[PDB]
Amino acid sequence: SMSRVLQAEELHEKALDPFLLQAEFFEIPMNFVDPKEYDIPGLVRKNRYKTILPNPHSRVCLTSPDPDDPLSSYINANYIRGYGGEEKVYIATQGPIVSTVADFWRMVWQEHTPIIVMITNIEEMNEKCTEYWPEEQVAYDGVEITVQKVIHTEDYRLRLISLKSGTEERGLKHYWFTSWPDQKTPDRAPPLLHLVREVEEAAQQEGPHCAPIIVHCSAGIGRTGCFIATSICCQQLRQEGVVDILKTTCQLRQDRGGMIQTCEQYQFVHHVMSLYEKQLSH
Secondary structure, eight states: OOOBBOOOOHHHTTOOOHHHHHHHHHTTTOOOOOGGGGGGGGGGGSSSSTTTOOOGGGEEEEEOOOOTTTTTEEEEEEEOOOOOTTTEEEEEEEEOOOHHHHHHHHHHHHHHHHHHEEEEOOGGGGTTTOOOSHHHHEEEETTEEEEEEEOOOOSSEEEEEEEEETEEEEEEEEEEEEOOOOOOOGGGGGHHHHHHHHHHHHHHOOOOOOOEEEEEEEESSSHHHHHHHHHHHHHHHHHHHHHHHHHHHHHHHHEEEEEEETTTHHHHHHHHHHHHHHHHHH
C-alpha cells in the first residue's frame, strides 16, 4: 500500500541516506505467517526456520506423489508476482535441506521451471543450502537430473541441466551466485546487477508465457527478495523511467512474508538501482 516513486536524482541521493532508508524500511510490516496455519505432524522437519513459513494464499503445493497427504504436499515456497503484478513470475523458496532435496526437484518438474537462481556463497554450503545437484547425474523420486555443462564466470556459475522423467526431457539453467557481500557497499553492486540482467535475458529467451523462475537463499526471503525486487525495478526503470522500491517491497511481502529481511539489504537494492540508472543514462 506504500509507494515512493523515485526519479533519478532522488534515487541516487536516497541510496546514500541510511537514516531515511531505515525509517522507510521499518515502517513496512513483515507479514509473517501464524505458525498455527500449518499444524501438521512432522512439518517442522521441512522448514529451516520455524517463523519463516509460506503465506497460504500464494503457497506452492506439491501434487505428486500424494496430493491427499498434507505433509507430502508441503514445501516452503510461494509464487511471487513480477513487474506490473504479473502472476507467478517467480517462486521464492528456502535453500533445500537434506530432507527436502527430492521435494525441491518435484517442484521444479511440476512447475516447468526453466531457471533456478541460487544465492549462497561457497563458504555457506554447510548452513544455508544443501548441495542438491549432482556432479554428473542423479535421480530424486523419478526426476533424473543430468548436469551437461558447468560454465564458470566471475559473477556466477551456470549449469546447463537436462531433466528427464518418463519419456519427457526438459532443459534447465541453474545460476549460482557466490558474490553476496558481507558489507553491502556500492562497490559490491555490479555483480548482482550483472546476474539480474543475465537472468532477465535468459527468461526472455524462454519465449511467451515463461514458467516460474525459482529463486532461493537460506530462508528464501532476504537475498531472494533483493534479487526479485531488483529484477522488477529494472523493468520498471526501463518502461516507466522511475523506480518504486517501496511499492515493490510491499508487493513482495504480500506474496511471501519477510521478503527483503534487513535494512542493509534494502539499501543494497537502492545502490544496485542507482548503478543501473547511471548505466542506462550513458
